[PDB]
Amino acid sequence: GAPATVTEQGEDITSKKDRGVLKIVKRVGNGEETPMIGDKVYVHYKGKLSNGKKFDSSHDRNEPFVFSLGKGQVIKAWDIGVATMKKGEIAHLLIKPEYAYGSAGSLPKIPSNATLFFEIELLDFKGE
Ligand SMILES: COc1cc2cc(c1OC)OCCCOCCCCCOC(=O)[C@@H]1CCCCN1C(=O)[C@H]2C1CCCCC1
């Protein structure tokens, strides 16, 4: 169970060391450059509630998913986790609601106090 594997085996990459974002690297990337805040980043991802109840993929949309790192165009967890990644890396994230959609949730897709699981591949990142 990919979400459980990440609970057991994930690195806590939070500042406050609150196990709110957990990470395993599943495939290794290239170089030592990782993206800085304001970098434009290209990814493919597979995502779900850890309940396994709703599911989501860039592939559904038939195209890469693009955002500006650390601009809050995504959840705090993504801005934190993707920043730790290298070009070509695949990693797994398990995320507590404080780094996702909180007690307010995001209905209908996301309920209150949801935990999320993503598989993310980083493809590219160009400077601001
Ligand atoms: C709460 O809304 C959604 C959440 C998520 C996917 C959604 C979505 O509908 C708006 O549709 C995919 C179409 C892309 O639309 C822009 C995504 C920006 C929204 C912010 O997204 C995020 O911060 C993260 C990371 C980037 C990929 C999308 N993600 C999500 O949380 C996903 C959810 C969808 C349900 C299963 C878990 C992942």
Catalytic residues: 45, 55-56, 75, 101, 118
Dist CA 106 CA 35 (whole Å):
28
Distance 67 CA to ligand 1 centre (A): 12
Coarse DSSP helix, strand, coil percentages of the chain, rounded to the nearest 5 percent: 20, 35, 45
The residue segments making up the domain with residue 122 are: 1-128
Q: How far is CA 45 from the centre of its chain?
A: 8
Dist CA 19 CA 12 (whole Å):
5
Q: Cβ atoms within 10 A of the Cβ of 73, count?
A: 11
Question: Is the CB of residue 43 less than 8 Å from the CB of residue 63?
Answer: no
Side chain identity at residue 46, one-letter code: K
Quickly list DSSP for 15-64.
SS--SSEEEEEEE--BSS--PPTT-EEEEEEEEEETTS-SEEEHHHHTS-
Count: domains in the chain: 1
> Structure tokens of 121?
């591949």
Task: Take atom 10 of ligand 1 and give the residue whose Cα is closest.
Answer: 109
Dist CA 23 CA 12 (whole Å):
7
Dist CA 58 CA 120 (whole Å):
10
Backbone angles phi, psi at 125, to 5 degrees: -155, 125
The residues lining ligand 1, judged by C-beta closer than 6 Å to any ligand atom, are 45, 47-49, 54-56, 65, 74-75, 78, 106, 109-110, 116
